[PDB]
């Protein structure tokens, strides 16, 4: 089949468009006709989308640039070993960050492949769920509500399609699609790929595949966009710049003191360059990137797709989770089970699912066809007034419409959908809360147009002037309204979604036939996750458009609505401006009868109170709320493609505890970054204080430049990036949600930093004095001082793994990367002491076993002090 342009296919009529593609409009192409056009045209992907460029990309990090400048200066001053050491440090930190980023991106790609784009395609006469990639031209694709168009289609059936094209055209207003050919962007019959179906149903024939799509260049350029830097990454780059600049000032003070007081200028320059490389947090942006990437991988292994990286930082700060009852807190497997007619009879509908199986029983007697008139008109309105179909036991439209269709097929009144010809349709909006169609009968065209309306009880009864009683139409009376409201509240209190139905001539003069109770069971595992998130201090709220009784009963069953809890309507939200809404909104647990405008108002009011809202709603109309929230969560398995396109994060298995896990890794990210910050800052302050005291008090320098560069490799390389790998605990399950502000340098953290630095400096200077008592500066002195500082740093790294828990509690072997890095640093120090060329380049000398034992015992004191402070603080908090 030759490829056809969309404009030509728009001018041309549908019949010939099917002919050129040899398309079967009803049965669809079988596998044989699919295979040939697949071989000719190819698969539907945009063909195929440099690793060395990504490796090079890391070097514009300003701290890495400062280290490169220091290495260049070392090269200029003929310092071979210094330049090699600095370059090795840069290469190892860059390699760590690059490997972590690559692994996270590959895992994210695998998870994205685990959720492929799909569509409803009829091929063998059976409507199946086929991937958008498998489409070949001429295939027949059925478009439902909240569907992303899989390929460029020519719609031969379109009753009330309304498709938004904001991503492609740039206009937010959806455009109606009509199946009539368009003679001579303006294609009102071609459904372009990449747009989303806001409303209505359709069936079309695909006219494009691969690069033949008319508007595929925007999606091509879309992949070439690069994700901007995360706000945490920006703030931690700023923090590293502050730390490097303060250390630069201190090092300049050291160098000026050395020059004015009198020392070797070249030696002071080498020490200054080595100290600048030391105290610059070259591993801080790298550890932030590693923590973010590792959190992405962990929540990928939790079956959650992270579309945007700055969400992982924000899930830790989340404190309120606002969800929808339909599709999020309930499995959305909707079913009509109770009918209350306008007369007063009660009908029980058995069976569950979007099928014809089950019967309507009235007073113990099965009712089919037109045995009971009022139930028959109820079922007829519920069948005709929809835009949903049930084909091959699969639903197309909204589940609440499919429940009515299944009820009609249960009663055998499905053929009444075809008997009525729709000429006027009032499109559903959640603000309206009702829908209506004006139809005429096929067999009796002489009969006047009759309008069917279904919706919320208040909106429907606002348009009803009459009602049915025993088969005759009477004027609607007030006690009839009272008993209808009482029965509606009675079904809603049992967890039934109540739909009111009216059939009559024109609008505003209809007959109220009664109500149907639609059972929507709650989603499994939501109650336990609500309990866990409440125990975590993360409040959970329900925002709905459904009635008070249904929302309250569902929330009571889940557990987010206690006996002493408040529920507020959308109209009360309208009556409350910013000041009252901001104070009432934490008290309310259930928001019912709220339009998406009211949902967005609730999100804005909760965000105004310093809260991080994580909206987990579904629905083709609830997407401005998902984009407006700080975090937008959707359901991968059972969710509209509109939400999954709008969501920031997608749950693959549709599990509410996964949001809790995302919050826990969000907290663990900041915990690990605090660990790195405290370790690096303590050892950097220790080294800076040692050199400052040596220059001020005229002692020989305890450390030389190559020793300071090895101390850099320890303090910013693998021994310190291992602390960003440190696993999450269970305390973050009970920990109060972190403030959205960074506040990285806690006063307690700074106090423990200064404590660790003070013990390290004092012990190292004590060893220096112990071997300097003889007044001869033998390089055994320098090697004892160097080993003392390195072992002090190793014990400081052991201490810095967890701020609160004791080292025995978390486990010495819990962090394998930390153990490997500690062993590597110990081996490197042993080589520096015991390998004669390394001894020559580091100006060291061999040591005795007893001297090493003394150094180990002395350096254990910083770990002992840290453990004592940890135990004291833990006992004080209890």
């Amino acid at each position, epitope marked *: 089949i030759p490829v056809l342009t969309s404009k030509k296919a728009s001018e041309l009529p549908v019949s010939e468009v099917a002919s050129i593609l040899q398309a079967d409009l009803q049965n669809g192409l079988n596998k044989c006709e699919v295979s040939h056009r697949r071989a000719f045209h190819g698969w539907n992907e945009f063909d195929i989308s440099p690793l060395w460029k990504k490796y090079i990309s890391q070097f514009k990090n300003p701290l890495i640039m400062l280290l490169l400048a220091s290495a260049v200066i070392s090269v200029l001053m003929h310092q071979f070993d210094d330049a090699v050491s600095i370059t090795v440090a840069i290469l190892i930190v860059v390699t760590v960050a690059f490997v972590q980023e690559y692994r996270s991106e590959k895992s994210l790609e695998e998870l994205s492949k685990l959720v492929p784009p799909e569509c409803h395609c009829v091929r063998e006469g059976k409507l199946e769920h086929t991937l958008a990639r498998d489409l070949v031209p001429g295939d027949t694709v059925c478009l439902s509500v909240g569907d992303r168009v899989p390929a460029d289609l020519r719609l031969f059936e379109a009753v009330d399609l309304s498709i938004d094209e904001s991503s492609l055209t740039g206009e937010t207003t959806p455009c109606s699609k009509v199946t009539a050919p368009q003679p001579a962007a303006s294609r009102s019959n071609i459904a372009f790929m990449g747009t989303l179906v806001r409303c209505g149903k359709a069936k079309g024939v695909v006219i494009g595949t691969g690069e033949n799509s008319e508007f595929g260049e925007v999606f091509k350029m879309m992949q070439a966009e690069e994700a901007p830097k995360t706000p945490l990454q920006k703030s931690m780059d700023l923090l590293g710049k502050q730390l490097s600049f303060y250390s630069f000032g201190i090092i300049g003070i050291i160098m000026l003191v050395g020059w004015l007081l009198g020392k070797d200028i070249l030696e002071m320059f080498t020490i200054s360059v080595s100290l600048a490389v030391a105290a610059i947090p070259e591993g801080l942006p790298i550890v932030v990137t590693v923590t973010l990437a590792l959190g992405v991988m962990r929540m990928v292994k939790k079956r959650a797709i992270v579309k945007k990286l700055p969400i992982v930082e924000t899930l830790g700060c989340c404190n309120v989770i606002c969800s929808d009852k339909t599709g999020t807190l309930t499995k959305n497997e909707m079913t009509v089970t109770h009918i209350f007619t306008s007369d007063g009879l009660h009908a*029980e509908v058995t069976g569950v699912g979007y099928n014809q199986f089950g*019967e309507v029983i009235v007073d113990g007697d099965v009712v089919h066809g037109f045995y009971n008139p009022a139930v028959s008109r109820i079922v007829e309105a519920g069948c005709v007034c929809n835009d949903a179909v049930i084909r091959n036991n699969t*639903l197309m439209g909204k589940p609440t419409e499919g429940a009515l269709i299944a009820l009609a097929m249960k009663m055998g009144l499905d053929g009444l959908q075809q008997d009525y010809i729709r000429k006027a349709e009032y499109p559903f909006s959640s603000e309206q809360k009702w829908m209506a169609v004006k139809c005429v009968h096929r067999t009796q065209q002489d009969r006047p147009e009759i309008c069917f309306m279904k919706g919320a009880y208040e909106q429907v009864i606002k348009y009803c002037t009459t009602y049915q009683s025993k088969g005759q139409t009477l004027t609607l009376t007030q006690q009839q309204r009272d008993v209808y409201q009482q029965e509606k509240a009675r079904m809603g209190s049992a967890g039934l979604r109540v739909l009111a139905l009216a059939s009559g001539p024109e609008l505003g003069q209809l007959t109220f036939l009664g109500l149907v109770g639609i059972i929507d069971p709650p989603r499994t595992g939501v109650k336990e996750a609500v309990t866990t998130l409440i125990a975590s201090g993360v409040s959970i709220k329900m925002i709905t458009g459904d009635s008070q009784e249904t929302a309250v009963a569902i929330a009571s069953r889940l557990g987010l609505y206690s006996k002493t809890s408040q529920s507020v309507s959308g109209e009360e939200i309208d009556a409350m401006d910013v000041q009252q809404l901001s104070q009432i909104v934490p008290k309310v647990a259930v928001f019912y009868r709220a339009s998406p405008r009211h949902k967005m108002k609730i999100i804005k009011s909760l965000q105004k109170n310093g809260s991080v809202v994580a909206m987990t709603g579904d629905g083709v109309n609830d997407a401005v709320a998902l984009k407006a929230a700080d975090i937008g969560v959707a359901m991968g398995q059972t969710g509209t493609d509109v939400c999954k396109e709008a969501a920031d994060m997608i749950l693959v298995d549709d599990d509410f505890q996964t949001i809790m896990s995302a919050i826990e890794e969000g907290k663990g990210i900041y915990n690990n970054i605090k660990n790195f910050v405290r370790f690096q800052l303590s050892t950097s302050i220790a080294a800076l204080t040692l050199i400052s005291l040596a220059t001020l008090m005229n002692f020989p320098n305890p450390l030389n430049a190559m020793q300071i560069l090895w101390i850099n490799i320890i303090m910013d390389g693998p021994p310190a990036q291992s602390l960003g790998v440190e696993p999450v605990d269970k305390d973050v399950i009970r920990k109060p949600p972190r403030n959205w502000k960074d506040s990285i340098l806690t006063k307690n953290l700074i106090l423990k930093i200064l404590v660790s630095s003070i013990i390290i400096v004092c012990g190292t200077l004590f060893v220096f004095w112990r071997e300097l008592r003889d007044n001869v500066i033998t390089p055994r002195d320098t090697t004892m001082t160097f080993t003392c500082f390195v072992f002090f740093d190793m014990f400081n790294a052991l201490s810095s793994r967890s701020q609160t828990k004791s080292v025995f509690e978390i486990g010495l072997c819990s962090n394998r990367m930390f153990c490997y890095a500690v062993l590597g640093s110990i081996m490197g120090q042993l080589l520096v002491i015991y390998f004669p060329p390394l001894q020559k380049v580091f100006q060291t000398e061999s040591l005795s076993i007893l001297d090493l034992l003394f150094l180990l015992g002395l350096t254990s004191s910083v770990c002992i002090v840290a453990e004592i402070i940890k135990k004291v603080e833990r006992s004080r908090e209890k």
Partner: nanobody
Framework: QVQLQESGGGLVQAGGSLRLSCAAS????????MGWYRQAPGKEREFVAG???????YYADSVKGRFTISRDNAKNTVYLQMNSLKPEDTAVYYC???????????????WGQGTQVTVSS
């Protein structure tokens, strides 16, 4: 409350004969509807076989003519016999019972834990 326990599921070859039974703790007399439902990955829950109030037997379109369903109040267990089963219609099987209902609106829909049946080529 009557509890439902499923048994009889297991590994079978294509074209063989299989048995299935959901037993009830109480007497199944007033139940106006009782059926079975396949749950399989990538698809929704589908009706298999059931009976209703007027002793009328309901079979799914893709299942009709192969599955035989019976009940007995003496052994209070609903039983299913499958013949000529194919590898492509295997899933996990759930038993559902509904009761008649008046002043409340709560659904008396009782499900079993389910027994998993795997059929290969």
């Amino acid at each position: 409350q009557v509890q439902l326990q499923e048994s009889g599921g297991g590994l079978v070859q294509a074209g063989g004969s299989l048995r299935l039974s959901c037993a009830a703790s109480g007497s199944i007399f007033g139940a106006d509807w009782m059926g079975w439902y396949r749950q399989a990955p990538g698809k929704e829950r589908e009706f298999v076989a059931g009976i209703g109030h007027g002793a009328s037997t309901y079979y799914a379109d893709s299942v009709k003519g192969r599955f035989t369903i019976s009940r007995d109040n003496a052994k209070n267990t609903v039983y299913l016999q499958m013949n000529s089963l194919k590898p492509e219609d295997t899933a996990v099987y759930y038993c559902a019972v509904q009761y008649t209902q008046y002043r409340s609106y709560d659904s008396l829909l009782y499900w079993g834990q389910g027994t998993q049946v795997t059929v290969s080529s």
